[PDB]
Design a protein around this ligand. Structure first.
Ligand code: HEM
Ligand SMILES: COc1ccccc1O
Ligand SMILES: [Ca+2]
Ligand SMILES: [Ca+2]
Length: 317
């Protein structure tokens, strides 16, 4: 089909996404950049979607975290999420798409601004949210690996899929874990969707980027990078260590698994055959140009190898 401004898309009902695309690129993402607003919106897809539990309820990726922000932003694990919810809410009021659709579309559009990124499959037609997510369904940085895995497993994700999803931390920073150093990134290239995150969380901790007493935080390997205790443990846990390391210097796998796994997550509580495929509306991301690497002056001896079957790959530094 061909839309009114001449732009084309496979299914005619996708046409209404183009003015939304233009709006968000200029006014949410501040000129199509891969900065803070993109990182925030990506976090929002997870905080929306993961409110889904067979035994307690929640409609998953349904927009409840906007529609019922009053409740859901009261959950400790949604600390800091109010900012991006209030940034997004006007877009949803102004345009004609459900909140569920908007959160997933903006996350996918955002990720497409990042070098190395992918086009997350996007589907249109999520009905408005009809209930608030139950409490206590969003994992935190102080939870154990077993607890994180059991929660994600409860929402339909296996341990390897939890790992793939965590490629999102390749474009990420924390504001609340250590409020004295807000905006400190999880890897050295928070504007680049690459494997530096899986490499750098594997280094021995050296120091604390700000204060030392912070719940959910591990020693970082670098002044200038912050490390979650959960990422620290996942990178070293016998259940997840090998999959973690298999992401290193493996951008084709990170791309493939992240797009597919985000797609599954974007559809929690939803049925894609009742929805319209509008994937081709997401922009084409820039490619990487620079090789994966250890930070300069670090070597293999700085790496806490945790995969018994496969030694950590020999990267340049
Ligand atoms: C699996 C368990 C996970 C834990 C325990 C976890 C924990 C965290 C924490 C503590 C922050 C920092 C919040 C702050 O203090 O500002 C964060 C940021 C982030 N999370 Fe995760 N997360 C998890 C999984 C995910 C998943 C599946 C996604 C997929 C989209 C995701 C995407 C992000 C993004 C994009 C940010 C950066 C936000 C920004 O820079 O504004 N997280 N996460
Ligand atoms: C994902 O963001 C969080 C914020 C505060 C506490 C736990 C979290 O998982
Ligand atoms: Ca939800
Ligand atoms: Ca990165």
């Amino acid at each position: 089909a061909t839309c009114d401004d001449g732009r084309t898309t496979a299914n005619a009902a996708c046409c209404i996404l183009f003015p939304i695309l233009d709006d968000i690129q200029e006014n949410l993402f501040d000129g199509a950049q891969c900065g803070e607003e993109v990182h925030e919106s990506l976090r929002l897809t997870f905080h929306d979607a993961i409110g889904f539990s067979p035994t307690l309820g929640g409609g998953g990726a349904d927009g409840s975290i906007i529609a019922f922000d009053t409740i859901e932003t009261n959950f400790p694990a949604n600390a800091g999420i109010d900012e991006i919810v209030s940034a997004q809410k006007p877009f949803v009021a102004k345009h004609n798409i459900s909140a569920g659709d908007f959160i997933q579309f903006a996350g996918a559009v955002g990720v497409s601004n990042c070098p190395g990124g992918v086009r997350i499959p996007f589907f249109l037609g999520r009905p408005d949210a009809v209930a608030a997510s139950p409490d206590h369904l969003v994992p935190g940085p102080f939870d154990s690996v077993d607890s994180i895995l059991a929660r994600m497993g409860d929402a339909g994700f296996s341990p390897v899929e939890v790992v793939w999803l965590l490629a999102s931390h390749s474009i990420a920073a924390a504001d609340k874990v250590d409020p004295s150093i807000p905006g400190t990134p999880f890897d050295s290239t928070p504007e680049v969707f690459d494997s530096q995150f899986f490499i750098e969380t594997q280094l021995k901790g050296r120091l604390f980027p700000g204060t030392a007493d912070n719940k959910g935080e591990a020693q970082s390997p670098l002044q200038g990078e912050i490390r979650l205790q959960s990422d620290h443990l996942l990178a070293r846990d016998p259940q997840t260590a090998c999959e973690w390391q298999s992401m290193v210097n493996n951008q084709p796998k990170i791309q493939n698994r992240f797009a597919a796994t985000m797609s599954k997550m974007a559809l929690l509580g939803q049925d894609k055959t009742k929805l319209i495929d509008c994937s081709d509306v997401i922009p084409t991301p820039p490619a990487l140009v620079g090789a994966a690497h250890l930070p300069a002056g670090f070597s293999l001896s700085d790496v806490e190898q945790a995969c018994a079957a496969t030694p950590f790959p020999a990267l340049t530094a």
